[PDB]
Enzyme design. Structure first.
Site, PDB file in Angstrom:
ATOM      1  N   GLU A 192       5.386 -14.341  -2.909  1.00  0.00           N
ATOM      2  CA  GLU A 192       4.205 -15.150  -3.339  1.00  0.00           C
ATOM      3  C   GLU A 192       4.549 -16.451  -4.177  1.00  0.00           C
ATOM      4  O   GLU A 192       3.638 -17.425  -4.401  1.00  0.00           O
ATOM      5  CB  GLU A 192       3.539 -14.182  -3.824  1.00  0.00           C
ATOM      6  CG  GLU A 192       3.123 -12.752  -3.163  1.00  0.00           C
ATOM      7  CD  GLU A 192       2.264 -11.731  -3.981  1.00  0.00           C
ATOM      8  OE1 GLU A 192       1.187 -11.803  -4.121  1.00  0.00           O
ATOM      9  OE2 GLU A 192       2.848 -10.635  -4.259  1.00  0.00           O
ATOM     10  N   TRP A 224       2.756  -5.525  -8.726  1.00  0.00           N
ATOM     11  CA  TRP A 224       3.661  -6.419  -9.085  1.00  0.00           C
ATOM     12  C   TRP A 224       4.175  -7.590  -8.037  1.00  0.00           C
ATOM     13  O   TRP A 224       3.558  -7.355  -6.684  1.00  0.00           O
ATOM     14  CB  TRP A 224       5.066  -5.533  -9.288  1.00  0.00           C
ATOM     15  CG  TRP A 224       5.245  -4.473  -8.194  1.00  0.00           C
ATOM     16  CD1 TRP A 224       5.895  -4.790  -6.925  1.00  0.00           C
ATOM     17  CD2 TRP A 224       5.148  -3.126  -8.308  1.00  0.00           C
ATOM     18  NE1 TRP A 224       6.245  -3.776  -6.438  1.00  0.00           N
ATOM     19  CE2 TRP A 224       5.482  -2.695  -7.107  1.00  0.00           C
ATOM     20  CE3 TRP A 224       4.538  -2.375  -9.376  1.00  0.00           C
ATOM     21  CZ2 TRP A 224       5.558  -1.234  -6.956  1.00  0.00           C
ATOM     22  CZ3 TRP A 224       4.511  -0.842  -9.266  1.00  0.00           C
ATOM     23  CH2 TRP A 224       5.009  -0.325  -8.019  1.00  0.00           C
ATOM     24  N   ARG A 268       0.791  -1.248   0.095  1.00  0.00           N
ATOM     25  CA  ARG A 268       0.073   0.061  -0.063  1.00  0.00           C
ATOM     26  C   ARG A 268       0.759   1.320  -0.025  1.00  0.00           C
ATOM     27  O   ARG A 268       0.055   2.335  -0.349  1.00  0.00           O
ATOM     28  CB  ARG A 268      -0.975  -0.052   1.059  1.00  0.00           C
ATOM     29  CG  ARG A 268      -2.222  -0.809   1.206  1.00  0.00           C
ATOM     30  CD  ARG A 268      -2.869  -0.870   2.291  1.00  0.00           C
ATOM     31  NE  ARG A 268      -2.539  -1.745   3.494  1.00  0.00           N
ATOM     32  CZ  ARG A 268      -3.036  -1.800   4.467  1.00  0.00           C
ATOM     33  NH1 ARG A 268      -3.805  -0.829   4.884  1.00  0.00           N
ATOM     34  NH2 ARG A 268      -2.594  -2.672   5.548  1.00  0.00           N
TER      35      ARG A 268
HETATM   36  C1  HEM Z   1       1.823  -2.531  -6.372  1.00  0.00           C
HETATM   37  C2  HEM Z   1       2.489  -3.551  -5.683  1.00  0.00           C
HETATM   38  C3  HEM Z   1       1.807  -4.290  -4.780  1.00  0.00           C
HETATM   39  C4  HEM Z   1       2.423  -5.364  -3.748  1.00  0.00           C
HETATM   40  C5  HEM Z   1       3.663  -5.650  -3.719  1.00  0.00           C
HETATM   41  C6  HEM Z   1       0.996  -6.049  -3.191  1.00  0.00           C
HETATM   42  C7  HEM Z   1       1.304  -7.059  -2.149  1.00  0.00           C
HETATM   43  C8  HEM Z   1       0.590  -7.924  -1.542  1.00  0.00           C
HETATM   44  C9  HEM Z   1       0.665  -9.186  -1.202  1.00  0.00           C
HETATM   45  C10 HEM Z   1       1.988  -9.964  -1.076  1.00  0.00           C
HETATM   46  C11 HEM Z   1      -0.799  -9.575  -0.891  1.00  0.00           C
HETATM   47  C12 HEM Z   1      -1.161 -10.984  -0.102  1.00  0.00           C
HETATM   48  C13 HEM Z   1      -1.683 -11.751  -1.201  1.00  0.00           C
HETATM   49  C14 HEM Z   1      -1.884 -13.360  -0.668  1.00  0.00           C
HETATM   50  O1  HEM Z   1      -0.951 -13.782   0.042  1.00  0.00           O
HETATM   51  O2  HEM Z   1      -2.893 -13.714  -1.125  1.00  0.00           O
HETATM   52  C15 HEM Z   1      -1.609  -8.427  -1.212  1.00  0.00           C
HETATM   53  C16 HEM Z   1      -3.018  -8.702  -0.813  1.00  0.00           C
HETATM   54  C17 HEM Z   1      -3.815  -7.679  -1.317  1.00  0.00           C
HETATM   55  N1  HEM Z   1      -3.667  -6.605  -2.168  1.00  0.00           N
HETATM   56 FE1  HEM Z   1      -1.695  -5.848  -2.852  1.00  0.00          FE
HETATM   57  N2  HEM Z   1       0.037  -5.487  -3.598  1.00  0.00           N
HETATM   58  C18 HEM Z   1       0.204  -4.459  -4.548  1.00  0.00           C
HETATM   59  C19 HEM Z   1      -0.725  -3.854  -5.233  1.00  0.00           C
HETATM   60  C20 HEM Z   1      -2.166  -3.831  -5.061  1.00  0.00           C
HETATM   61  C21 HEM Z   1      -3.110  -3.068  -5.731  1.00  0.00           C
HETATM   62  C22 HEM Z   1      -2.733  -2.153  -7.065  1.00  0.00           C
HETATM   63  C23 HEM Z   1      -4.163  -3.472  -5.053  1.00  0.00           C
HETATM   64  C24 HEM Z   1      -5.686  -2.755  -5.548  1.00  0.00           C
HETATM   65  C25 HEM Z   1      -5.788  -1.667  -6.210  1.00  0.00           C
HETATM   66  C26 HEM Z   1      -3.900  -4.304  -4.126  1.00  0.00           C
HETATM   67  C27 HEM Z   1      -4.975  -4.626  -3.017  1.00  0.00           C
HETATM   68  C28 HEM Z   1      -4.750  -5.911  -2.493  1.00  0.00           C
HETATM   69  C29 HEM Z   1      -5.920  -6.502  -1.649  1.00  0.00           C
HETATM   70  C30 HEM Z   1      -7.563  -5.979  -1.761  1.00  0.00           C
HETATM   71  C31 HEM Z   1      -5.381  -7.737  -1.196  1.00  0.00           C
HETATM   72  C32 HEM Z   1      -6.125  -8.901  -0.256  1.00  0.00           C
HETATM   73  C33 HEM Z   1      -6.376 -10.020  -1.318  1.00  0.00           C
HETATM   74  C34 HEM Z   1      -7.098 -10.954  -0.608  1.00  0.00           C
HETATM   75  O3  HEM Z   1      -7.578 -10.757   0.312  1.00  0.00           O
HETATM   76  O4  HEM Z   1      -7.087 -12.344  -1.162  1.00  0.00           O
HETATM   77  N3  HEM Z   1      -2.711  -4.563  -3.928  1.00  0.00           N
HETATM   78  N4  HEM Z   1      -1.070  -7.438  -1.537  1.00  0.00           N
HETATM   79  F1  LIG Z   2     -10.048 -16.599   1.921  1.00  0.00           F
HETATM   80  C1  LIG Z   2      -9.352 -17.358   0.842  1.00  0.00           C
HETATM   81  C2  LIG Z   2      -9.530 -18.828   0.984  1.00  0.00           C
HETATM   82  C3  LIG Z   2      -8.788 -19.651   0.041  1.00  0.00           C
HETATM   83  C4  LIG Z   2      -7.976 -18.942  -0.969  1.00  0.00           C
HETATM   84  C5  LIG Z   2      -8.103 -17.553  -0.882  1.00  0.00           C
HETATM   85  C6  LIG Z   2      -7.292 -16.728  -2.005  1.00  0.00           C
HETATM   86  C7  LIG Z   2      -6.376 -15.748  -1.820  1.00  0.00           C
HETATM   87  C8  LIG Z   2      -4.872 -15.961  -2.168  1.00  0.00           C
HETATM   88  C9  LIG Z   2      -5.844 -14.603  -2.856  1.00  0.00           C
HETATM   89  N1  LIG Z   2      -5.190 -13.666  -2.485  1.00  0.00           N
HETATM   90  C10 LIG Z   2      -4.798 -12.823  -3.571  1.00  0.00           C
HETATM   91  C11 LIG Z   2      -3.549 -13.309  -4.088  1.00  0.00           C
HETATM   92  C12 LIG Z   2      -3.169 -12.520  -5.217  1.00  0.00           C
HETATM   93  C13 LIG Z   2      -2.655 -13.333  -6.651  1.00  0.00           C
HETATM   94  C14 LIG Z   2      -2.017 -12.177  -7.608  1.00  0.00           C
HETATM   95  N2  LIG Z   2      -2.130 -10.964  -7.304  1.00  0.00           N
HETATM   96  C15 LIG Z   2      -2.338 -10.452  -5.843  1.00  0.00           C
HETATM   97  N3  LIG Z   2      -1.943  -9.036  -5.836  1.00  0.00           N
HETATM   98  C16 LIG Z   2      -1.771  -8.128  -6.506  1.00  0.00           C
HETATM   99  C17 LIG Z   2      -1.839  -7.071  -5.861  1.00  0.00           C
HETATM  100  N4  LIG Z   2      -1.969  -7.407  -4.598  1.00  0.00           N
HETATM  101  C18 LIG Z   2      -2.292  -8.678  -4.451  1.00  0.00           C
HETATM  102  N5  LIG Z   2      -2.898 -11.095  -5.094  1.00  0.00           N
HETATM  103  C19 LIG Z   2      -8.849 -16.729  -0.143  1.00  0.00           C
END
Ligand code: HEM
Ligand SMILES: Fc1cccc(C[C@H]2C[C@@H]2NCCc2ccnc(-n3ccnc3)n2)c1
Ligand code: HEM
Ligand SMILES: Fc1cccc(C[C@H]2C[C@@H]2NCCc2ccnc(-n3ccnc3)n2)c1
Ligand SMILES: C[C@H](O)[C@H](O)[C@H]1CNc2nc(N)[nH]c(=O)c2N1
Ligand SMILES: C[C@H](O)[C@H](O)[C@H]1CNc2nc(N)[nH]c(=O)c2N1
Ligand SMILES: [Zn+2]
Lengths: 407, 411
Positions: free
Chosen positions: B285, B280, B111
């Site tokens: 991940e 990115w 963020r």
């Molecule tokens: C730009 C570089 C970014 C990085 C390095 C990053 C990194 C991450 C990582 C490592 C996670 C954990 C995902 C997982 O373990 O499943 C995550 C979750 C998340 N990110 Fe990002 N993110 C980026 C951009 C964004 C953007 C552009 C958005 C939205 C506009 C965003 C919104 C979210 C949301 C909503 C989650 C939670 C997803 C879930 O609950 O499954 N992120 N992010």
């Molecule tokens: F509540 C759950 C139970 C089982 C799987 C699950 C999926 C979780 C893995 C997905 N989280 C986002 C993973 C993902 C993949 C590609 N890009 C991003 N991404 C991009 C920017 N920020 C995050 N995140 C939820």
């Protein structure tokens, strides 16, 4: 009201009913979660006593027995007349075992029923406490074949006669400041080390000086005692590959023994109740050795491995972290001192969880604390949903005595 | 009411006032913490206060609170709701909204970048083909030949719940999984179910270990349609290790653009059920979760063997050792190919700064510790030692059920 926990690796779902017996509060509200915060009278006491006796007598399949009713009877009489009551040995042991069973931050709880309980409620002086603690250390250490133990000193009366072990653990290394501005020994224990000094310790200003015990009996001012060296089992740390590792001069002790916690049973408070189990390797190698505000030896090891420490992206910290932990496990196993790796421990804990869900209807678990500080997601507990809640009997934190002590 | 969070490494104490603006429930109660649980048609009634709340926030941020422009806008929105049972956001509000949903995403470690988000307004879109085109342009823009740019594309909002736009893929770019008759899996085990749907919908599966899935796109509540992302738009990176030459022979590669396509974006009471976004990758991940999860590609053993580690007892830490080299490989390969990636040390360090900046300028920063701490080497990153508060602010991204479980099939 009946809650499900899912394991996302195995799709195994468990149903928690036990949380509905929870009495104490979490710090969390419906508007905010505090799961990552480290620390969020005669009429008061009888319900508490009752709740405990009810579960004790339920555990021995005598709920609603005359013996049960008689005990409730006798304890109520005692409270009304004395403002407190005394636990039978059977109740004390059950309580201690269940405080461990209920300890949501402890990954080692599969062992909970094999706790050796030392009744030290007859103790009156600091020398007495010292004797009991030496006996505990020797029993638990068992020449390296460690055995879980707790020693329980007298309960709180009017809070003016508290038994306290001032040390946070029975066995720790001192920490001293330098005019060099750096830190000698264990930075975690700088303040406690000074209170040893002002009370009269003769520190040998070294790096790995086993701290003396500071023992408070019956609300009195605390006294110093050195634990007989011969009882403190220590392990020199070598690597089974890097010959240079031994030249770092690292050692660690075998016995992990928490001594600053408060044991609460049936409304009674045991402010001095040191307990010990055995080490999970990460506690020492990841936390004690690699934490920034601890021994912080990462860079030194990193250099000795000749790693590229220019950019974080080489993951030189991660590489070194692994080898340090390899060495810890190796050193302990070589010297035949009980230790568990984080893979084996977490594997055991999932088994314990499933047992607890099956035979008790749940198992309180603090995920933030149960997941090891390295390699989190390759251990099964990472993928295990957990519910955290407080059951009693319990181990609770309590304030450091030096902030409270009316000298 | 003020709340303090402490960093146990630096003793830095921060004060949270922002949590007061939280409305939504957490899952937790005074008696139970659900902090580790993964997942714990709207009347005009509830709609206007949600709209007003959002627009008060918008107009504060532009220093026009209480202005005539502000008041006229409330009036305009009120009238539109009252007569059409919904309303349309201005472009400026949409942009503000999407940036702030990201900013409020308590599980996102990325963020610090929140204010730099390219917002693509796809609310004029009406068909699956139109969605495909918009998504192609998003992938091309975001990929930028390896120099990744954060982007989000926003399809039209929900109306009656019968006309939803949905991207059925969980991510825009993902590899197929195929359950074999012998119980083993070819490709990514996570995508077995979705791969089956695709195949059923007529996808001709190459049936290899790294097949980019087709997009399955639902417009206006109609049945979803299959499209193939042009291969030339899908940037991929072959995985090799800087010191081990046998590593390339493992045949591994990954795609460069991480793009979540199955979340719901809530802004001012409006629900945007198709809002794919991309940033990115943080190296873990891929290197930790995608390759080494037991329920995913699960390559730890094979890597370990090739390294000739002692695999007889876990206490050799052979798994931790293989895990590290794999993550070195992922980082090496991406950097070498000039595809944007961040290691977990850099990303967590930046998040702490972001988080501290947010406490000063904003009065808080909601964060989910369970998710912010990286899945390897946790305690040698600064986030591990950081107390965090988790609460839900709007605008927000929310989970929503998979569409195959809810979709009413037309034919
Ligand atoms: C730009 C570089 C970014 C990085 C390095 C990053 C990194 C991450 C990582 C490592 C996670 C954990 C995902 C997982 O373990 O499943 C995550 C979750 C998340 N990110 Fe990002 N993110 C980026 C951009 C964004 C953007 C552009 C958005 C939205 C506009 C965003 C919104 C979210 C949301 C909503 C989650 C939670 C997803 C879930 O609950 O499954 N992120 N992010
Ligand atoms: F509540 C759950 C139970 C089982 C799987 C699950 C999926 C979780 C893995 C997905 N989280 C986002 C993973 C993902 C993949 C590609 N890009 C991003 N991404 C991009 C920017 N920020 C995050 N995140 C939820
Ligand atoms: C026998 C093997 C044992 C193992 C492997 C084990 C493991 C652990 C670990 C890894 C922690 C995390 C500590 C930290 O990071 O600070 C912990 C905490 C804890 N353990 Fe154990 N333990 C064992 C025995 C015991 C026993 C015998 C008791 C009590 C009778 C106990 C009660 C507790 C409590 C109350 C905590 C929370 C401490 C705190 O909040 O700081 N454990 N345990
Ligand atoms: F909330 C806090 C703020 C600052 C320090 C703190 C001390 C906590 C870390 C210690 N927890 C116990 C560590 C420990 C040490 C030795 N043995 C065990 N041990 C033994 C059996 N089970 C656990 N645990 C808390
Ligand atoms: C802030 C955070 O709660 C704190 O760093 C916790 C994280 N998890 C932990 N887990 C264990 N086992 N021991 C600890 O001391 C901590 N510290
Ligand atoms: C049960 C537990 O909440 C679950 O496995 C979580 C743990 N932390 C995580 N953290 C991230 N970044 N991503 C995840 O998928 C998860 N999974
Ligand atoms: Zn909580």
């Amino acid at each position: 009201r009946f809650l499900k926990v899912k394991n996302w690796e195995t799709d195994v779902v468990l149903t928690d009913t036990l949380h509905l017996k929870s009495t104490l509060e979490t710090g969390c509200t419906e508007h905010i979660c505090m799961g990552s915060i480290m620390l969020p009278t005669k009429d008061q006491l009888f319900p508490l006593a009752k709740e405990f006796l009810d579960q004790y007598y339920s555990s021995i399949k005598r709920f609603g027995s005359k013996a049960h009713m008689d005990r409730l009877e006798e304890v109520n009489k005692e409270i009304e007349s004395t403002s407190t009551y005394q636990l039978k040995d059977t109740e004390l042991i059950y309580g201690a075992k269940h405080a461990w069973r209920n300890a949501s931050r402890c990954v080692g709880r599969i062992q909970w029923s094999k706790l050796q309980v030392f009744d030290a409620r007859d103790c009156t002086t600091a020398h007495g406490m010292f004797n009991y603690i030496c006996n505990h250390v020797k029993y638990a250490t068992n020449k390296g074949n460690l055995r879980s133990a707790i020693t329980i000193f007298p309960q709180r009366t009017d809070g003016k006669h508290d038994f306290r072990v001032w040390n946070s653990q029975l066995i720790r290394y001192a920490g001293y400041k330098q005019p060099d501005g750096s830190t000698l020994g264990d930075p975690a224990n700088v303040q406690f080390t000074e209170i040893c000094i002002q009370q009269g310790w003769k520190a040998p200003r070294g790096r790995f000086d086993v701290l003396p015990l500071l023992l408070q009996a019956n609300g009195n001012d605390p006294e110093l005692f050195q634990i007989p060296p011969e009882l403190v089992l220590e392990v020199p740390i070598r690597h089974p590959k890097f010959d240079w590792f031994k030249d770092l001069g690292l050692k660690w002790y075998g016995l992990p023994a928490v001594s600053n916690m408060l044991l609460e049973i049936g409304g009674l408070e045991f402010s001095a109740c040191p307990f010990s189990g055995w080490y999970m390797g990460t506690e020492i190698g990841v936390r004690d050795y690699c934490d920034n505000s601890r021994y912080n030896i990462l860079e030194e090891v990193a250099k000795k491995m000749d790693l590229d420490m220019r950019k974080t992206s080489s993951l030189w910290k991660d590489q070194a972290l692994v080898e340090i932990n390899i060495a810890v496990l190796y050193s302990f196993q070589s010297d035949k001192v009980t230790i568990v790796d984080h893979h084996s421990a977490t594997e055991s804990f999932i088994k314990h969880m499933e047992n607890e869900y099956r035979c008790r209807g749940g198992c309180p678990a603090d995920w933030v604390w149960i997941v090891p500080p390295m390699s989190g997601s390759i251990t099964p507990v990472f993928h295990q949903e957990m519910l955290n809640y407080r059951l009693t009997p319990s181990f609770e934190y309590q304030p450091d005595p030096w902030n409270t002590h009316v000298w």
